[PDB]
Design a binder for this molecule. Structure first.
Ligand SMILES: O=c1ccn([C@@H]2O[C@H](COP(=O)(O)O)[C@@H](O)[C@H]2O)c(=O)[nH]1
Ligand SMILES: O=c1ccn([C@@H]2O[C@H](COP(=O)(O)O)[C@@H](O)[C@H]2O)c(=O)[nH]1
Ligand SMILES: O=P(O)(O)OC[C@H]1O[C@H](O)[C@H](O)[C@@H](O)[C@@H]1O
Lengths: 638, 121, 242
């Protein structure tokens, strides 16, 4: 007799009160709506980073009878049982919205039990475990600690059903342990990427999306020296009552590389912060865009022949992965976009930003001189207008006397004196670029300029920002930051000020980048091999999607050159839009923002926690409904 | 030696072969400009709160003519952006203010720069 | 009675014979402006101080990134002028914010004022509805309310025009066209024209309120009007924007 309406929840990951990778943000942003449903039933488990946990965890006492409710008592005794073995652990609240209960196991307080467990693991599943790989060692320690801990809680709680949720191989070890020790807990495993996937796409010569149904998993895994790691990922996948990925595209990849069709998808969601007024995001756009306008002025100083009221900001942003973030396609496509725009005699301009970190020696003197020279113009003009104001005012106040026949001045000469002009003329001369110098394609001195993939590509396709080029290239090899002396915008601000995000990804199990974009109501181009793009693809009919500002490029059933040409079409489709058209598109894009919010994506997590229970206890489940429902999908269950 | 509380900043302005201002020189003025601006936003906010207090006293339980507690005027949001500004001004451990505003074409051979090094200023 | 935390400032703009703005009206305006300029000066000084701290931290014994005591920022010279300006805003004991902005010619027999007097809306502190009669047409040169009428209208929340005789009614029309909700009567030209265009319950959601002056006694009418105004007051910002 165990409760399926009223059940516990344990979510486990390496990256708890501890930022290592993207999973941090996911568990964080997801916390509100989980606590909303679970409150003190919900608990998170992870390791213990001693060097940081202080800034993240509200340290609590788990000993006072006040800490746990009457039905959540077994946990108190279960944690006690673990202290009954000298296992050092911090209990408490995660300093984040929703403030959820965490169990953080200190790892050194089991390090001794290493070899005994390593050996136990080796003969149970067959998982080798080299000593020089500090990470699998930590994954093992953690796995044993956590399964042990769930062994006790299953003993002591007899009311609720227990759900254990694991994220990513690093925190997957416990999963075979739970299946073989036959413990009374339904388990879920989510994979956010596959080991073999990342590695097979690393060199980026391998034709991933076709040849994967044909690779020898053991062979490759051994080729990359990650057989041990791989075994863990595969174990976790196989042991789990429910197996999930973050997206369709990764699901496909999981099936053939981890040898199990995943039961369904858990797309990452966002904690969408709304505004009182719907149109407030339209305002912020124009505000932030003015700051980018400010930068472009200085960047193009003495070579500024276009109209910013007719300019579009394109960006790719993210990790510097030339081939997997599709920076190659971006640049190629832009080169072609320039051709199409010059040819049609269009007067529009595209300024394309590339925001990707690379080893640099900070900003070129250029980039800073220009920004300061425009400032020095701004300040001078402000002086002059003040003098002008005096003169207008005097006219306006003394008319019609002293022979003032007109209400206002009519000769500029009455308002602009020669010393005003001399000054202004001087600021203008400061902004003049040396003969034949075009504005740079990069705002930083680079550690290895000659070998940089991006710069080489920009120079190969010859986008050098000449006056005749209607597409412009600016590479900013550093993450954005309000403290930036030349582009004082944080990233999210910057995104808001842009017109189009362009993320033609090749390998991207989720892609937080276009999602963040969508939420800020910025249109974006994605690919069908991207987790986000693939998720969006199913939610909307293709022609409709463009009107919501989601463009999806086919990188799966098309030659790279066809894939590029599509990218140019979409970009060119977008440039032809009028302001009114873009405004509505953004309004539409902003309207999708809801569907990416946890209030909606959280259901998928629900459906998966359910499928776990209907699988663990189909008898109790059947009767607590009306009949037994289909259980080969999370889809067929609800 | 004399315990003087004063300071002298000595400029030397003499053309030498140079490759223009250093990135440090320009960055430093930009970060100070950014501080100024962030300060100007913050005082506009404070000003709106002083004013509200002033025009409202003694109603709605305002006992003092003026604010008495800074927390009435400076809010969390203001403190964060000012703190970020201060951080941008911070310079790496044990770095000293340069003795030169420019990149020199021949820095090691410069007479002025050799003499300043020699006297350890 | 319902303990509403809201407040309603009702303006009446209808030209009456007058002797221009009361001295009080103009004075109040110059006094506020004067406070604003003083506040501006004080915050400039405050600026220098925050700035100075900020550039100097952590040297010369400045141990926190920012000032923490108000006294570091607000000197006593600043306090004195802010106090001089606050004193100038003071109005003698008992005196209430006026119900009119101009000196009226034959004030005692003005209909508007008389009705206001009669209902006792004298702009008390405990009055949750205030009342201002501006007996001249608005224009941006108005020294106390420098708005043209159309501008003023965009600024408001609700136009209330309970006409008994109105062949058309430009008033609530220019009001609607500028996205400001309006209350009108089924005996108004505009009212009837609109009631005829929407379904009458739906019409409330498009911000056209129509009080029934044909098939209800003046007292049932007045009560309907108050139901309308009350319903609007209950609204939140979001709903007002929508
Ligand atoms: O200047 C930047 C550029 C990107 N990002 C962040 O880096 C991530 C890039 O995603 P990925 O390429 O790591 O998937 C995004 O979540 C985005 O918020 C920044 O914080 N600052
Ligand atoms: O301060 C004002 C107030 C009203 N009106 C005008 O008064 C007319 C109201 O119509 P009626 O019913 O008074 O004729 C409208 O055309 C409106 O523009 C003004 O020009 N300025
Ligand atoms: O930058 P664009 O796509 O041309 O759009 C610019 C427009 O954006 C926002 O909606 C602003 O609220 C409008 O005032 C502005 O005109």
């Amino acid at each position: 007799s165990r409760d399926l309406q009223n059940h516990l929840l344990f979510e486990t990951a390496t990256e708890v009160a501890n930022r290592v990778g993207g999973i941090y943000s996911v568990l964080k942003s997801k916390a509100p709506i989980t606590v909303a449903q679970y409150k003190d039933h919900y608990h998170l488990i992870g390791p213990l980073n001693k060097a940081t946990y202080q800034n993240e965890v509200d340290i609590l006492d788990w000993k006072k009878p006040e800490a746990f409710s009457d039905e959540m008592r077994p946990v108190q005794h279960a944690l006690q049982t673990m202290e009954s073995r000298g296992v050092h652990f911090v209990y408490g609240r995660w300093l984040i919205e929703g403030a959820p209960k965490v169990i953080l196991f200190d790892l050194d307080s089991v390090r001794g039990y290493s070899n005994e467990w390593k050996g136990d693991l080796w003969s149970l599943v067959g998982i080798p475990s080299p000593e020089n790989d500090f990470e699998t060692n930590d994954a093992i320690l953690l796995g044993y600690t956590v399964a042990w801990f769930l062994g006790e809680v299953a003993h002591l709680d007899s009311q609720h059903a227990i759900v254990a949720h694991f994220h990513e191989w690093l925190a997957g070890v416990a999963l075979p342990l739970c299946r073989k020790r036959r413990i009374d807990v339904v388990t879920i495993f989510t994979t956010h990427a596959t080991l073999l996937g990342r590695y097979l796409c690393a060199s980026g010569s391998f034709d991933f999306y076709n040849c994967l149904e044909s690779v020898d998993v053991d062979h490759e895994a051994g080729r990359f020296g990650i057989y041990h790691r791989y075994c863990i990922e595969r174990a976790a996948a196989h042991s789990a009552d429910v197996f999930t990925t973050v997206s369709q595209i990764t699901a496909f990849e999981a099936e053939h590389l981890l040898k199990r069709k995943p039961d369904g998808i858990l797309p990452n969601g966002l904690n969408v912060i709304k505004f009182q007024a719907f149109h407030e995001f339209q305002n912020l756009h124009a505000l932030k865009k003015e700051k980018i306008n400010d930068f472009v002025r200085g960047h193009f100083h003495g070579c500024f022949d276009f109209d910013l009221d007719n300019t579009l900001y394109f960006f790719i942003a993210g990790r510097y992965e030339y081939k997997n973030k599709g920076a190659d396609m971006f640049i190629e496509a832009l080169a072609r976009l320039n051709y199409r725009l010059k040819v049609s005699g269009s007067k529009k301009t595209v300024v394309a930003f590339i925001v990707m970190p690379a080893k640099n020696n900070s900003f070129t003197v250029e980039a800073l001189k220009g920004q300061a020279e425009v400032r020095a113009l701004e300040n001078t003009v402000h002086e002059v207008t003040t003098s002008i104001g005096k003169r207008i005012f005097d006219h306006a106040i003394r008319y019609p006397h002293n022979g003032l026949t007109t209400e206002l001045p009519t000769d500029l000469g009455e308002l602009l004196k020669s010393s005003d002009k001399v000054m202004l003329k001087r600021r203008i001369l400061a902004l003049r670029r040396p003969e034949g110098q075009l504005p740079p394609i990069v705002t930083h001195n680079m550690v290895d300029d000659a070998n940089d993939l991006i710069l080489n590509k920009i120079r190969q396709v010859q986008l050098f920002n000449s006056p005749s080029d209607r597409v412009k290239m600016i590479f900013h090899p550093e993450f954005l930051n309000a403290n930036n002396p030349i582009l004082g915008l944080d990233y999210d601000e910057f995104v808001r000020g842009c017109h189009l995000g362009v993320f033609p990804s090749y390998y991207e199990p989720w892609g937080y980048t276009p999602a963040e974009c969508t939420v800020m109501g910025v249109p974006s181009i994605t690919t069908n091999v991207s987790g986000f793009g693939s998720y969006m693809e199913d939610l909307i009919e293709t022609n409709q999607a463009k009107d919501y500002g989601i463009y999806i490029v086919d990188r799966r059933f098309k030659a790279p050159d066809e894939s590029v040409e599509q990218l140019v079409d979409y970009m060119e489709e977008f440039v032809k839009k009028t302001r009114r058209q873009r405004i509505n598109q953004r309004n539409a894009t902003e309207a999708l923002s809801d569907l990416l919010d946890w209030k909606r994506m959280g259901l998928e997590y629900v459906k998966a926690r359910q499928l776990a229970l209907r699988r663990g206890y189909p008898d109790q489940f059947r009767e607590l409904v009306g009949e037994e429902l289909n259980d080969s999908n999370m889809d067929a269950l609800a």
